[PDB]
């Protein structure tokens, strides 16, 4: 399988009261997006198919500088478990646009 | 006594400066809602009667994805100690609606 | 590792040889679904892995005029023993929706 | 909370109506003694509290020429269901001594 | 000197990046408000004269339930060091109104 | 374990044999209400558990023209020694309201 | 080289999910602004030239009292790495105005 | 494969400067001794064949009460990696004799 | 029941690999010796009858200054669970002799 | 801060006007010596600072044929109220020696 | 120390003597840029320090009709071996922009 | 303990016998104000406690046409040696305002 | 008072179960030896007179390289509280001999 | 994860087509054995997993009069590329023994 | 310079009360032995010349399995600072003999 | 960072122009040697780096009949200002030996 990109991203809406936000190591391929505990990839957390996924921007914060974008299933109400969308946070606008371009190669287009 | 549901919920307005938010293990029966330190139920924190309690939604956040709903006493100004309402936080909208349906079985209807 | 929900559910399809339709205490975690004789958890009847487990609806038949849903394995023919599907029943429709939401959190998606 | 020992033991006094003398997987903690169908722990037959539980010897009868010891409740007449005492058997005498030592660690003292 | 009240309060605007918020043990007299590290009062942090102090409400948050009120010097731009006002946070509205009434006895009236 | 409030209060109903109405230093925690001779806490007169303790009003009599409230046990006849209720007095009405709020935080609700 | 000022400042938009905010020890000269791990200056984090830098205010928070100002390159889209601006946070308005005056000596004027 | 015993043991000579001693969850079968991070057995540390292994006592301590016994390969100089023997520590003499009896069932006899 | 003495003692031979030594709050009466987590006595660890107990000195250490004495049952091999004796550690010789004198009042005489 | 010892002691020199020689519950810490009516610690009679407190013997008089020691202040004439010295009595001589040792740990040295 | 990105890139200027234009697996950290034979990272061809490394564009020549950018050292003539600049190619223009953003995060600025 | 600011300042009132008006390196903490020969801090000329230290203005005299402010002790006549007040000068008025703000943070208030 | 020496030393026999050993900042004068929490000397732990003190070597360890020497009162059984001697530990033999020479200046001679 | 050893070793069996016998920089961890061109680790030639890797001796041939040992895979025919075994040479016999010991720590046992 | 070996070793006699033992990353060359904080070698702790150094065994422990050897200067009393010898600890005897052989290549022979 | 020693020492070679031989307060750390006017450390005369600093003896001349040693820089001609060596004197020979030991700990070796 051809890997498109690997890098760290922060899952912004999965956890919260359980344990802050925490960053995960993501591996995006043309077929799926998988995230692991770290770059050693010896402990996988989940593998999400990119089928029927689209991407969209999300403005939220007004406290600490952050940039969010989310993946959502267009054929379903919940993209993963009981979550409507998978919110991924990056440090800069540059990094978000960088990841968006990568998702484009996997067929994940903006809403 | 018949237990309606057991699960974790985050008390959003009781603590703060004392120690974040923290999650508690809740046990809802047709007569009362009790919360303990954990699912071993060997250390109870409080038992709240469901008499005269109603439920309502609360929109707050704009920083980290969270969903809140609160229990309040209609015959009193403070549902518990000096708190106007007991704010319970869930991770998703699905989970909130799931708990609301459970409260319905205990006679706790929305405002 | 975290317990998603605990509550009573009725197994609508138990063979008369064992007794018939009975109510059991269910414990749902992100990894397993277990059912005990009662809420003291002294006797665990079985434990199913939530992997490859899906959920579908069961039509409200006149005789069994209740609300039912079922769990089945997508890889196996029998989910538990010789049963092609585990039928769980609830008094009201609101309770079924409630449990469905809890199942989503565990990864058990509908068919 | 800590698990003291896990190992197979034979319940020498099961009523034929249920099957007869069988081998079960025992889990001994400082608080409870549980036995499952097998080591996968999918089916827990029962769980006894180690409080007020004592141990005594059972004479090696010609028919049941094996090594046996028993657990009984000092407060109750029946330890488990309608059994006045739970008889546990082992192939050798060394295995009985071994388990006795493990029981001491849990507080279950001999008579 | 006659002590009017002693209790814990959270200083909301003094610290932040240095170390969260933290709670201090306050001692209010008719002449001054002093705060210590804890109720043992063996380590004083500061003593503020109540002369020329007034009190006012402050609405801020929209994330975590909190209630704030501040003390400010009417004859100065900074009530303490280079801080315009001393923001004190309480857990409930009841507690804020409770403290306000205490400040009233010290001659600190609302703006 | 946390101290809710410390402040002077007047016990309006002490028997002349002991002296008469006197002012004592009160310490209110979530578990107990204690009163000392003075704020140095060298002599603790008594300590009451806040469990089953409630509060009610005492009418402003011409002779004792002050503001008073009382604490009583819902299970016992005498809260402290041979007293059916502990009467606490304050100079102003604002001080009574202030203490009532503090009592709510401890669970002592009005009648 | 002549040092204009040395002091602690909080970098508000560089880190976040990586590790809160954290404070850095800054050293401003007429040619550049450098920040280190601490005042021992034995571990430098970065040195930023003041050429083409301007300064501007930033209103954000509404949760915890904070005052922000940022440095930005007028000839570039990113002042440092992929960051549009370098957001520096101070505890008070006094401290921000104090630092602004210092930046003025280095030729960094407000936008 | 038939499991003889499962329980916690402390590896006394493998680690030291790396990280104290730490306890491991052991699983002894008639063919091998395996140890994992914990009783969930989801993370195995090593599996040691019982072939050519013998057992012997080791007196050491004189500071904190401890009881040691070791496994060693009679056909090799190092039983595991570059360790001459695998030192296992128990809390009491009873527990050591208990484990020795278990090893006896696996063919591991004392030296 | 008449309490002879209350104070902290270190249990020297119960724990070790589990968690150092740790100190416990002891309560000695004429009938038994009980130890709790702390002086609040809200969490009891064990209650040991003083019947058939004797006391004896134990020289061990040669690393860090410590003084030990142990309680042992003369009619049993294990005074508590599978422990031959209960080793209690004090900081000085004075404190050991102080405790010995207290045990004397409970009928626990030296070997 | 740590509690050195708790135990009953007899105050041999109380004025008849208050009652006479009585037994009280003593609490000795490194900073204070307090005595309560009984072991429930609801009524604290007094609290003395251990600073400048010394201990001396009191001769066994025929009438008061018991074992006594006393505490006195080296700076003050009266240690407690109008008493030049606090006389503590015990049934046996071994109990006096025991308490003396405990007092040493608190810094109270003999004369 | 943190890995910024991992992905395949084509080195457009490899000498035929070695093979020609090839695709390699790049690992970009804040300190180094490394390239391996493939994503298993068993063979690391080279590692360049990101210090004094800059990036510029390479014109889309008819023959090499692809999108290319290059890295060069501002202090050295040859960045790697005898190459004046490292030419990296991508299928689309969006991929070049994506990598440029990642390079900014590492400090590698455009010319 | 925290360093508030470091920067060069001119002591405008040094006796010619020592040299005359000179520029020194100042270090301001919440507890002390120190001045060194230069920024290497090898020679500390003096250290003043910020307690009872206040600040006032010094009129811009034609000869000393610069911007000056002074520090003085409210309890002592001489702040440093035989000087009634320490006069600190700056090139511009903006620099004086800047330092005044820093002094506020240390508690040194204007007269 | 003339200070002879200041430096860190480890108190080897005071603490143990309470909290390891810990190092203290010592200040030796011709009249006494005082130790504080740290070199800021803002928190004194104790002041010991050098009158009647002598010094002696102590061989103990055989585990971790350490060198001990103790101070003891020749006219008393306990040099400090209920401790027979004050054991001070140094890292090397050089440091012990260095401190011994310092004690010599205070009149503390070896036994 | 921990690095066991780093040092130069000579690969005695490299095909002339690549160059011939050469010296490389080896890095041995508990999981892999890697070799680089030199100690700067810029070029990693290969990385072998230590699983199923064993070691054997190679006879000192007159031509290659040096000390050699080899690594081979017990499951595969070729350990690296087309080589049936990796031959590592050292100047002296003591160096071979040294490396063998290091290999034991990694689990690579002799044949 | 030619590096002979790199690896972790525990310095057994340098630290103790300061902070346990801790392991350091050592780099041995024919001219010197250097140790750093970790294998990144970005923070050197010390560089020791091998001139006049010899090596010797040291038997100590009797508590936790450990193997020690030390380097000492034959022309000096202290090999490094005020330490007579540099004690290095290894986990096994194999590792010690492995390191000894390495030291042999640097001219460090046993005593 | 740690302070090795603090104590008074006499600088035996100060030029009369400054005053003559004087006693100063020395602070020795592992990185620097500083001397102040007195033990309050308000005036630091100088600070020398301990790097390349060595120590040698100075002959006891009849006039300066005291015990002296000196510090000098191996790289520089003048250690401090225009002094070829810093001469430190002590009353007794034991004090010189004591300081020499302290200097060893800092790395300052004799010549």
Swiss-Prot record, chains A, B, C, D, E, F, G, H, I, J, K, L, M, N, O, P:
Superkingdom of this protein's organism: Eukaryota
Disease tied to this entry: Developmental and epileptic encephalopathy 31A: An autosomal dominant epileptic encephalopathy, a heterogeneous group of severe early-onset epilepsies characterized by refractory seizures, neurodevelopmental impairment, and poor prognosis. Development is normal prior to seizure onset, after which cognitive and motor delays become apparent.
Function summary: Catalyzes the hydrolysis of GTP and utilizes this energy to mediate vesicle scission and participates in many forms of endocytosis, such as clathrin-mediated endocytosis or synaptic vesicle endocytosis as well as rapid endocytosis (RE). Associates to the membrane, through lipid binding, and self-assembles into rings and stacks of interconnected rings through oligomerization to form a helical polymer around the vesicle membrane leading to constriction of invaginated coated pits around their necks.
Protein family membership: Belongs to the TRAFAC class dynamin-like GTPase superfamily. Dynamin/Fzo/YdjA family.
Domain remark text: The dynamin-type G mediates homodimerization and plays a role in self-assembly.
Name of the featured protein: Dynamin-1
Gene from which the chain derives: DNM1
Post-translational modification: Phosphorylated by CDK5 leading to synaptic vesicle endocytosis (SVE) activation.
Subcellular location: Cell membrane; Membrane, Clathrin-coated pit; Cytoplasmic vesicle; Presynapse
Coverage span on the entire protein: 518 to 628 of 864
Subunit structure: Homodimer; homodimerization is mediated by the dynamin-type G domain which promotes assembly-stimulated GTPase activity. Homo-tetramer formed from two dimers in the absence of lipid. Oligomerizes into a helical polymer that self-assembles around the vesicle membrane, when associated to the menbrane through lipid binding.
PH domain residues: 2-108
TM segment ranges: none
